[PDB]
């Protein structure tokens, strides 16, 4: 996935476009919006991702929710540096072997998109 394409909704391939469509739905979650509104200062997305899996579990609902909060911060971002930081931290989270190996073993991004 090109996370810059995803968060900008720009020059998306079909898979990224479908994940983008799912993201959008997710960004309407009341609990997600409330969580976002409670922390307007942009946090470290890589750390958030690693904290989510700190119980030893991962699933596609968690992944979609992490992308969703990332999109919310990206939409409200106040500088290009903030957008670069979001994109790079998402890229770094999903490029960790522990996460990339889970995705590859659980249907790949195509399985996320086929939901």
């Amino acid at each position: 996935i090109n996370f810059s394409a995803l968060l900008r909704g720009e020059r998306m391939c079909p898979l990224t476009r479908e994940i983008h469509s799912q993201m959008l739905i997710v960004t309407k979650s009341y609990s997600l919006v409330e969580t976002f509104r409670a922390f307007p200062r942009l946090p470290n997305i890589l750390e958030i991702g690693n904290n989510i899996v700190s119980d030893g579990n991962l699933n596609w609902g968690r992944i979609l929710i992490l992308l969703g909060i990332s999109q919310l911060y990206f939409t409200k971002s106040e500088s290009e540096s903030e957008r670069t930081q979001i994109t790079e931290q998402l890229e770094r989270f999903f490029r960790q072997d522990a996460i990339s190996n889970w995705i590859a073993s659980n249907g790949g991004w195509v399985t996320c998109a086929s939901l």
Binding site: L32, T35, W60, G61, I65, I69, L115
Partner: peptide
């Protein structure tokens, strides 16, 4: 006091699992 990343993550795990159960 607590890192925001820890507070946010706790909530997102809970929401993510509920989304996983209902829709995934």
């Amino acid at each position: 006091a607590l890192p925001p990343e820890m507070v946010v993550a706790r909530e997102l795990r809970r929401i993510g699992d509920e989304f996983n159960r209902l829709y995934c």
